[model samples]
Target: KKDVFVPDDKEEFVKATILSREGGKVTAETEHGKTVTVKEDQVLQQNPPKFDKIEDMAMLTFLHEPAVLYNLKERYASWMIYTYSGLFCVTINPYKWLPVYNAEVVAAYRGKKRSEAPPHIFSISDNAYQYMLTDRENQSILITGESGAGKTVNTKRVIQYFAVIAAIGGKGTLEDQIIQANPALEAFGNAKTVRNDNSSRFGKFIRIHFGATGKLASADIETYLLEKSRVIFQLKAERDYHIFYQILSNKKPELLDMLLITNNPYDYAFISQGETTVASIDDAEELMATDNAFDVLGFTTEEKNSMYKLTGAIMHFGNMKFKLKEQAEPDGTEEADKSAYLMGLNSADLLKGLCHPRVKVGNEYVTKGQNVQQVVYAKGALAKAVYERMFNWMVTRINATLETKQPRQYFIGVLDIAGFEIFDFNSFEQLCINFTNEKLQQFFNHHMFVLEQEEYKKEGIEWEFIDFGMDLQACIDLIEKPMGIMSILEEECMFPKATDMTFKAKLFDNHLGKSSNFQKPRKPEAHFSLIHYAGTVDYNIIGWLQKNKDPLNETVVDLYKKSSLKMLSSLFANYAFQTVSALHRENLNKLMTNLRSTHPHFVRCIIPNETKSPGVIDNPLVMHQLRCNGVLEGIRICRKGFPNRILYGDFRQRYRILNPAAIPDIDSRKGAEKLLGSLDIDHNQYKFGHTKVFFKAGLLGLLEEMRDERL
Candidate 1:
């Protein structure tokens, strides 16, 4: 055991013994006969030597910033990537693959007590599964990490664990089909970018629905932001997307025949202008995998052919051209003919519909002629619209097969939301995503005790909701409250004469000094900065107003609806108008409500090195990530407060076996006190609130184990 600690030469905490305390500081006689001093507020207790690589940080008595970082480093150096900080499971991405995720390992954690096993995602993953059947409650694991923090890999493993353990089917199951959902989306949903070859350009929220008997009943896969710009343009070293090149790899000849495309990708203009291939990837093999995945997801032969036809049409869609003078009598008529026929539309009507689209004049409709700018813009816009709509259709269709026609009871969901990001030129997207992350942390603090305490005040005492939302409400108010960023932006969008300049001026007038978190840009510039809970991000207001106002569709949407084919018409079937950011606000609000309904587990992932190489640890680099994510603060609050709490009635119902001696008849609250006190554990581990029993970090697990032994 090592109790004495103090700062060393490197200004890090080292073993020391306190000498005296005066002048608001503590004097310590550290190792090697050295003397040191620090503020008394900076010190806490220390752990014994047995907990050198403790699995959970809450076990430590001294939970300062460096202490938490050091514990993680000690474990990570041993290649142990997963650890626990109270209810949060902290994972660092090990750059190289390991042999930890086999069938043998899955069985190791299937039903073992959580404390009986080493710290792992599986150890925590199954912990949630038991809760589902243990109390008949829904569960959610909200994963937060950076781009390459490997949340998806963890997300994949979480799905695999549930699919293997909880499937209603035994030898033969939809587990095989459920596993196919990943590649099915990666085929069309992912894109190769300048910085990343396998960038997931969309957002996904996956729900795994189960029935009353713990059977895997159905699933619903939802996605947003399909990267529409990637469809027609690739100025950087990137490909258009995967599907076209997959079909063009010359692996399958029948594909080119029906789709009417070529083996050489450069012949089509859309496939050109960027790196056609990356060395590490093989398009021919991936095409087969994507096709097989679709087959397992129940795509019919006809549906597959239609989807491939749409793929080839985008290539052809990129080739069509309209000129400044008279459409040049349709100079790209051949490409137009092929693209139109693939969509089952007459080529003449396609030309007329795009070239001379009709506009509404008062109570009547009037046809208007368009110039080169309008025609060319419309051409590229439709290609983007079609590809995006088709991707959405695929997600919806796969959800169709996942539905088991059974009534829903309890559902388990995981959100692999994109982490908070900041760039040189932050725009509407950056503000929106960072706001999502901010609200998530705040909502985590807004627990059942928050609402429960408010009701207690109206009805009656002795119970109070402690402050857990540290500095998050101020940042949240700046973005979400009255005269906040989003509310003001909505008011600007309502005025038809508003522009970015007007919106910026209105913002400065409203929040220049009146708001604490929002600040005017330094050096008198055109930008403004918001002190977000994660970090300070400066935003460019050039395009925020227009993006929020829905500035695009005049009559092109109507043209798609008036098309002669079913496939083309389906793209515009559900196209309706809502002020963009306003709708986003509503959708995000509903997501928070749904998440609040379930018991939650938090997983925070860290990327070890930027080079994606192993055997290295950047201390200063890793330290910043831990601080920004509030990993240290979580441990501090968890060490001091009770995180595991249950209602008096529920606590009595779940753990009544531990105190069978009290069967003579006691109230629910009294029954809980007797049940917990009679367990004969440390008195310091739990507290009895007015309406619930509050437990420290490991107290609940102790109760579970004790209950098992009593049985």
Candidate 2:
């Protein structure tokens, strides 16, 4: 779209239409209609003209960089947010509220096939809903977004769409319980913090359970790790999870007094170190809604209050400081009094444990002394542990309310989870995040390519295989296989003698030259770099081993086991020796296993923050988004290549009636070729493979209608 086109000053760049390449340099008429000579390396060759922008990018014949962005840019300018690249629905996130979604719009997409309307999340949602009933199979909508496109961000819109389209009753009704679960869970699970990574760090899966008649029933929320690092620490520009501030909604001052927490956020040092954004009157309403959600989940009176009270203790505990010029009580007795009272533990023992903790020895435990900084570390550790444990417990209680005895006939799972990770200084958590993304990325390629070509290969067809930049399987094995990153991590975690350096030594020694994805740390012994599919990240290694262990002041935890408050003590219930990564790996492994069993859909939300960069060849910002957002990747593999592929046997079985003479007893592979031949489907519209047939974009819909009409 951009080659029929029309800057460098202060050594800057501008788009130009190239006229000729004279030797090492290129001559072009500048976008301003002047002549300029720029290095060939600095310029990109543009695509030939396509007169109009496309609704589906895959339909464009010359699927190049300029064609993709110009299509999105023009569509975005026209306030058209949703568009298609084959099967994937993409959005140029206009978080701007619009009249686009309403009862009328919902009804428009209701029973309509995807081709019958423009691309949309509504279309994506309803398609899966339709596929579940039509196929009688479990369906999944996997939504992955980056910084601005947070999880649970685009998901509730889909969930609420089902609320209206289905006969979903409102409020605390059994049918609407899934609705109630989100407002409460979303607040606790998501946080807006220091880096953009912090905003998208939390992950969850909401399985919209369905029973007979294909109607909505109960739902469960599967939450992954929240960034517990921010629980006790925040940059000056960020605050804790919105749950902390939502409680200070200030509407119920009496409840605030009862919990012994003031409405002012400044009183708490840990929370106050950052900006506390004052939300709307809507924020006040949202606070009440979260509590109502609590009630809807069947939390008893005291049970609810105990949760709120303990949340307050973390605030006060954060305020408590260590300064016992020391053979004396710390200076934080003022703040400590409230924290200890809330935990209902003896103040001295909890305080004593901070400065003197229980250390592990062979067949024995010994008391270990701590300095001021160490005590402070112990305090923050305890704070984060309490916060995380409570979130998991809350997730547990919600699942209890959503649990229905009726056996599920089917379910629609929407995975609104973490996306790709790239930050200034990546860490162990980023490794897990990027690894999760690799697993997800592989799912897409495997689901699309292997799911197609494997059948071709399996059926013994004469098909040529194409690589769609899917080197991710090897990257996944580098981290997930035995003696790989996680394997070595688990091995080192269980050993008492391992240090972060020992872990680094093992990683460097095991993988440095063997795997191409593994590489140097960029810094001399400071960071380790792994080339993720989206980008390469340098992970900080200083506290790598310690984070895996998640050690806290043990004596204080022992004290909590005997606390006066049963709820507080039980929150610290699991006294296992499992390293955090092992548990995270188990959770991740099970998630992948669950996903493989369902028919999956992908919705990618793109943020067009780079609309300012208008020129071709110089638009790396938007280009980077497309590369990583999984949009252009879909286009590259699916646009020029086949978007939908069908196995020979499966294709012949369904459509043989269209050309009965070709099948009956013929080889299924030959039968499919004859059947397509009989139907007058252009040979160029599809490809004959070893085992399957690959259809160009939109041709599958033609066959779909042909099959449906006869059925």
Candidate 3:
């Protein structure tokens, strides 16, 4: 065979060393060291060699799949989980503890530029802090990944970095409380899921304020839609919220008896649905941590007692079984009566609330006795609602403790929301979570593409707008546009005679049938499909109507409202009337607005494997995540366009060291041009503009290297 490799005209495929030229064709030496003849236009110099560590690969030139995966694998084997792909930081879940995050490491990253140190989450944190101080603007770091992809851990690290840096003078109680608040929230708001031993079941946006002097001021947390249903039901191999098993396994016998809770978790319907306990978790230790967090977060003893009471009540409520009654009589309310009596609760009140719920119709109230199934469903609903409201109350209390009366200057908000989910059996809960993620992805696109491009244009940066084809606006409009799925569902919910089947029919005829992203499955009549940004999920709509209604028995709500316990009563007292969809939309809108006002930074996390095992990297699984999390697209866009751009003044201020002979008081554009010329950077690597300079993804790293060498 002839040892010759002809070069193609494509930019990525151009890899030829010119040997000679004849007429309109040129002879070149191929990468295989073979002589080849090709048109002059087909011969181009190869790109710069790729760096082994992705942190050193400043540009998106090495944008192939194999190159990306190779770099990730190499770094991961060396216990380095953080890597930078252009503007985005891609993190792989180490799945095991490493000694990389410590006080010394945080100090090293403090006040350093992004290129000064190795790739690290702390670097991102420090950059945000620096930008906040220098620009006097707000910042937000959006962290997203699969369930167990270290999103929560990284979020804690970000907070830890700020806490460490801001407490320069001394340990601030506010910062300590801010860090400790996580444990208490984890106890009630997190759970053991199939994908993760500790999965966050809710979304949280924490905004930390800094005064004009760069000292810690205060913080506030805005919580989004919590997975309340998980309180009553969990998938196989999963457990309920950490607090449930924590109390069952660790609480004193007297405390359990006082709360009317059996020591065994299997006795309750909620906890028994899945594995009762996780082998890896120490319930007693976790309970201690929760207690410590509660104290640090300023929760009063009475409020603590109220929280435990609600927890115990939920457990007891789950044990209250319903059976069909033969007749209505003073003592014939069925088997549920015995459960109420055993729990030491008023049997009549409990049975009435579950079996014969009183609901308000317009201005009138009527009692309706339900069947066994309805009663069971009502009991579960009550448990979920009570737990959710209690969680919200706790968050409100925490925010109150962290609130500052002083005038705030700037803040850094960290958003840790649920990742995209597509399971074998997706349901209404999955839809809600995925829809939230979709909206978040849309927001990211808006910030990264639209907003960034607009800013570049306004700054007079010369850039060709790249069509990333990540136009999630179409998918967003389908979901949130006027008369969209949510609006149609709300309309059906308001109809007096609308049922789950009718809702499905309306969706099938009016929406799903006409939309490309939605479909009606052939096998299951109650099943439909949604083409989510991550993947296509087939959702079962069997309970869509009831779930949308989110019906909590008015009798049970009133019962909690009238509780002798002040905290519990106060929780249900301000009961709001809003549909689940409406509330989710409202929360999402608020989050979007908050994000829009701040300068955004992104950290996209990747789960290395499905088994949650360390030192194992499954290529297919990771590659799928890379695609789904938009890392691949990010690199692609970064490669095809000018990924790094800086204002002329900032450029001059930062890179002035490379050219000491340049006049300090010259125009920023001329100063930057002189600096680049001094460094001997290729003109093709950057573009000059009226106000800013734009560089190819990795070009700035070269300048940084030169500056570092001179120093």
Candidate 4:
């Protein structure tokens, strides 16, 4: 039997000690030759050393010391406890955590904070507060991460944290209004993909500026590259969860007339494919909760109406009808000439209500084609575009409600964008996401690589321009080059000549003429070929367009032609447009409007593990399969560009499963020593957990610190 004990002091118990390593059996004669087998469970009684201060804890967790310091006294406001890790304290203590030293320039712009000013500045929150404090500069926060990795939740927390600290005069309504935007955005922007239960499918750049005394100002928004193309396509076993589920669930009984919603989730073409019968999302309660949140956000009746109206317009567009018609009896010809009826206008009344007017070719009034097909197609595209833009707008609007903006001087922006994906059915959206990441990587290198080299050259520090930039830029250019597949596809969509559509189809079929960099296990012998998506329509295949056309079959050609062209041309032109068009000037305006309204802060949240909620049944086998496959592969690709330390959480009771010897019997002292020694592991660069005595990695120091402390 092995003796076990808990050390009274941390530092004293961590000295070098050797134990027999043969099959968990110890036969030693040094201090006392007690023939004992040190079972793995004997080491489990030891616990993580508790720290008196968070700063001390931070020192051990991260290699780079945190710039912000948090005091858990009167300053502490909230605490979140992880299942495996202990509690983490949250606070709005600007003095403790804000980058005050770097905010001299912003302070000059905003004058100074009154003693009673909201407690809205911290490391994350300070970014927003500082942005608002300065007012003139365009401040943007890019939050990027794989779905379900907690990016959206963190984004919401950021907004919530900001609202709490930035809300002046105790305007709790303002905070509610700000936080409520999450539901609206999630309903419109998020969908359930195979990788994530719910994921945001678009990139949103939110900019907020401020005015005098940091009040709400005018805001505008611009959205880039919505996965609108998803309307026509989806991964097998995956469905379009946002519009189908959300619209069905969020549509209020009283507001149905205003929204003009005549059908539920079952009626939509893309949505109906998910299940045999059209039903709402599995978690109907959650949908309702999000809808309720929309009301709490202080959205006026008119605002909600406009939102639904847009949704209805999109649905109407999806249902527009078109037919290949022939001109009335042309000289006894057997051949049928094709003339489109209701060109794109599937629902005449719906079209009239939603569309404004447009003129083509020398004052010829083209009042949004009366043809059902054309109108439907146009409406669907417009609806999706407007929804995306409004989604971004809502974020800024929340900022306005909270009043946060760019403060002069230095500010840190946390970005959470979709990670690169190399998958079985990869497409244009994946390419765009990867390309965007490439540009971002270039920016990161400029800051963490090239700039460092130049600085080193000046100061004589050893340095090299890590040519990661070249690889990253190549990826970007591949996605955006004039002759690049994405570029050619966009050109074809914008100007869909017979040749253009044919070329676009050929490009897609040929796998964009680029080799796959996907490095995941594949069952290449699967029956069907994997569908490679490039975020565009396959115009040459009439049937493909028919099924995916936003308004389904009715508005096929006109909508198809318009959308294909607009998708490619609009997306490409915006990014490659004039020097700064891609900078998202519109989104910046919206951000400013929100920042001027109130003080704002940020909070970053993480879902400890893959559980939907605490105590939920998360199939371990399925999760294991997901990790074993490309999910982890995609995460690894993201980690190379974004430096985030990974932390895994597990049930503490089950900790001894890996090594039963780790479970320590706390009743005896020798057992404690054996337990501590079992945890000692040598450092390997990539190794996860071990003891500190062998090398500088894993739990060795942590154990030693625990033994020396009296937690």
Candidate 5:
């Protein structure tokens, strides 16, 4: 029930209507001294839905509460605009919604029909154009909303709009280059996540530079955490995104050979477990098209190979095996169980695959064994390693595209990072993401909203420092900080004597508060754990011992050692060549060289709707992921729970004509303009023009005005 009329949309008329209603709470008097009463609920019922157009339904889906018109005049009587720091840094009244212009507005000004204008520019063209004219060194448009709020699709629109203007001249190949880059990036970035059908599981910051001719320049991509760990594990009723299924369904003979995948999706440990497939994505052709797009985008054979190598490596790691058993029989003699081996590799083999050195115990070196527990450990570690390598590789690829070839600048990055999801069985990974978001929120407060305005005032670089790195640093600290929770857990994990049970229990004890409150423990005897995490060994302990030839505890260790080393060598050796080399090099410069000091710009893409689909609500799970994860921090929180009203600042300051109507005297007008120009209106890119007013009137009225203006 959104019946209240916001001030930006016919303020006097709305005030009158509100007062004219019977038994009204938000009441006022008309010009003729007639008392009008408008009931809040009745106002909501009559003009209940607050939508500028059908498209605004996207925002309304997520913003449910009734919104009061933020009376800018009341808030700051002398000033036309006010700044709020809670979520976004600067919130201004945008001119896109006004009542002064018609179709004739554009025809009179530019002699072009409204329809002739690019769809991308219909609503925010002036804003976009203004943003470009400002010539700011590094500008970012931060957008954030819950799922179904149109975050991803809106992000695409922003990029498309920027691309239309930015790619106006010079290069013919630019459009193709940009379009081709999408499918490939989407494959890597967007996935079939629980929150949104096609959810983006990572955050991306893009920097685009324009050349002298205003054509495409160089672009670089900075990526945040990816949900690669999800490749090996997924919550119940939740499946990995479309890419995994796409790759599986469309695997060619050559790709199959490379992956050594004799088993179909039915045979793979994780693939077989989810819903059959996603029909919405057009899986078969989309997969093929994605590969073609990747090729056009200039990903070489070697690079593609490396990318898949990393994916396959993770899959292999998830299948590692391990087990637990009671020490039965006499201590003098021990029997070995065959199933204890990790992915069928002994201890040394497993280590070798992971590029870890084998440990020596007494007179013998530990190697892979044919036991359940050993195999499980190997797979778990390999899966994690593969996931990590892929994450590093993705950043390298994005950088390579932006830097090595075109050097195009001023990128409008479209990030499809998944929203927050809370579930029954979350782990350390979830905690890391949530904590990262907390830190990001802090940064948003500092730079975007002025939460720490005094701190900035004292720090001296308040204007110079954009607070872009706050989100990034938060992510880094979550996993790497010396005293951070993850750092402590990792230390315990790597300690020489920590047992699996102890580690798991300690992890639960330390991070339980941060986890989703809906968690329900699984019965050990269940057919499978709700999620198919590869490292779960307890499930197979009883079944394995029954099939194995009665293995003793000491003998089990021996068998594990034998199989692990071989597996490790095979896996690690392949990984080093395929992906690690590039990652190692990148890490070297960051770690060994003092290169991180170079300040980079921070830009975030906010999608107004859920999924890449134009108008859809985000699933419950995706919303949880977005909120609980650090990605939410990237969202400018200040704008949350606000109505989509015309920002008053755009009218009072930016519109040259509005000055005379509002301020009257020429000297006062000039003074107001000068004052308005000095502040950080840079955050709101909107410009006020009469054309926007007619657009608000309705398309039919716009057409009529255009007809009149043309004559």
Candidate 6:
């Protein structure tokens, strides 16, 4: 008879030993070896439950689609949101908050082997910590998912874990300061979208520096393209950045009156086009969080108040309306514009700036009068530009506070970037966001697949390269090459008479129409399609040229440049606005360089459902994300190719004890062969090259187990 357990409650079980069974009841023995009767349905089969935890699913005997999905489903059913697939930690977002991230749980995972604990993000952070300390190498955790897939929350959890464990037993520490910066960032960089109530509209890579002793030293953050356009225009169901709503809902009455703003968010033209508030979000509470964050990040009282003033200026600017002049006047005709009056600027000066903005042409100045639509476009453009610059300025200020005097020995970076997006109507902004994701996906492929294979080859490991047909170089070239779409768009923007229609024609004639990945729509002359790795998305070209040009009336820029507000003046001073594509390319290049320097760990988050409700798993949606995010590709490569490769000398040195009869003075490769021969391992499981050995994903783990047993 074998010992088992009978459930006393859903979470509690009683120890018993199986003796015999009849009908639906089991006759068993307890810990005292006494026979006990228990219902079969109430009896747990074994202690610690064989299927309750699979630390590494790569070790499963059958590694295929059905088995992998089943294991994930089973673990997820038990409220286990994290699982391991080879080197990755696959996280499924449980829409509701779980108590899995408390201090007790953090303590439980400290100094424990990965297999000793149930799968958790804390385990990943701890492993990275241990590896960094042991190997003295920098580490990075790449967290990625869709809009509402909990990427930001998971990233916060990782930072939280490090902050708690790495603290020096003090209330005020570098880690605490770093953790407190999130709320202020989210206030300005996040917004309410159709898919998520609090979605991060920007991508950030945070580098946490560590000293030689592994204590936290300092940190810095590099932000990618913020969705600046959203600041000016939101979709029918979306709201602008959370800061706008926060001030409207929570700011003091005197501050609101001073800024010339009303209490309701609907009073503002910039944010009122969409729903004013989300039922799930409490702006007042969020305001409190932001206030606390500002204090932690060292924002001065005046600086904080200036932020609200700038936001109010943008709101009043959005409310401005323009009408074409009845006839051109010498000083510019105006019929009492209320926008300038409300924003505390002269009406004639504002009207003059809007109607006849001067530009430098050759050696002389040229003044141009704009139509009503052009004037409206200019207002929105100024708002976007101001907010974009302010966001960057905020990041700069935070970095200044977090900067350290001593140099860092090593660091751990966490990247929280947007996932693949496909919407009903894609635009130039979507094109930019999607293109960024494509580059990120390419980086993931290179880091996980291509570079891995190259390392094996470079080390002289026997590796049979598997073609997963995921080479994105062509698509990347199409977008980023010298003569690619960006170049064509930039060239079009330089022309004085270039229109959206002309740009579309140029796209077809010179750039992308002949490419297989680019296609034209049947009915819409303004629509173009590009087959992204995630899927094909059709982008409307109506405002492509204008968005690419990103024009701001020089007079308006000058107006802001002369403002008494120090923050506003600094934002417009010496700021040369580049085309969106150029800026994006530069930022992406920097991101790639920083990431390439570090050892990378991946956390792929999956959204369980579209409704964002907890405990509901949708198989088709989950499977689709897996395919799109290259999870399945990663699995396939791991299953078919040798993922773990080691140099011959290292392999022999580590496993020489397994072959006691082998000669001591031989070369490393021969010693490796002898060691492998003694183990009686299957030839297909590993391969030998001129100077190294390559093993399948989990073969090294098995060999380690055997080594431990013999030792």
- C-alpha lDDT score of every prediction, in listed order: 0.75, 0.73, 0.76, 0.38, 0.39, 0.76
Indicate the residue-level lDDT of 685 in model 4: 18
How would you encode candidate 5's per-residue C-alpha lDDT over 187-300 as one tens digit per residue?
Answer: 766665444566666655455555533455655566655655466556555666455666666445566556555435655564445554654667677778777776766677
Candidate 2: which pairs clash? 7-13, 7-14, 456-691, 461-690
User: What TM-score would each prediction reach against the true structure?
Assistant: 0.86, 0.85, 0.86, 0.50, 0.53, 0.84
Ranking by TM-score: 1, 3, 2, 6, 5, 4
317 Cα displacement, candidate 5 (Å): 6.5
User: Candidate 4 has what TM-score?
Assistant: 0.50
Show how many residue pairs clash in every candidate, following the order shown: 2, 4, 2, 99, 120, 1
Question: Candidate 1, residues 1-711: lDDT per residue as tens digits?
Answer: 224555554535565777888989888776567777788876555666677888988888667766777678789889888999877788888877888888788878887776888888887778877788777898888787665676778888988987877652511256767788888787787656543465565667788888777777777887755556567767546787788788888888999988788898888887687878876678999899888888888888877787888888888877887776644335668898888878777778778777777767798988777777667666777777788888988888888888777777887788776556655556676677678778776765454335534544443334455554454778887888778888889889879798898999989998889888888765223378998766788888886775676444446566567666566688788776566667767778788888878878788888676666674666665666677677876776566667677788989888888777764445888788767677778988887777877777788988888888887
Q: In model 2, where do residues sit more than 4 Å from their true spots?
A: 1-51, 168-171, 194-200, 278-285, 325-329, 359-366, 421-425, 473-478, 481-498, 501-526, 610-618, 629-633, 639-642, 645-695, 706-711
Per residue, candidate 2 scores C-alpha lDDT tens digits across 222-326 of 888677876776655566777778788786676688668888888887777777773322556767887888887778877778777888889989887776564
Task: Tally clashes: model 3.
Answer: 2
The CA lDDT at 272 in model 1 is: 80
Give candidate 2's total backbone clashes.
4
Q: Across residues 359-469, which tens digit of lDDT does each residue of candidate 4 receive?
A: 445855454434444444454555454445455555544554544343323322334555434444554455555555445434433433354345435543333434432
Candidate 3 structure quality by residue, lDDT tens digits, 420-449: 766556677778888888887778777666
The reply for model 1, stretches above 4 Å from the true place, is: 1-48, 167-172, 193-197, 233-241, 262-281, 326-331, 423-426, 448-469, 480-483, 488-529, 538-546, 549-559, 562-565, 662-666
Pairs with backbone N, CA or C atoms under 3 Å apart (clashes), candidate 1: 4-16, 5-16
- Give candidate 6's error at residue 168 in angstroms: 5.0
* Model 6, runs deviating above 4 Å: 1-53, 168-172, 326-348, 361-364, 510-513, 522-526, 645-696, 699-711
Q: Estimate the lDDT of model 2.
A: 0.73
Candidates 1 and 6: which is better by lDDT? 6
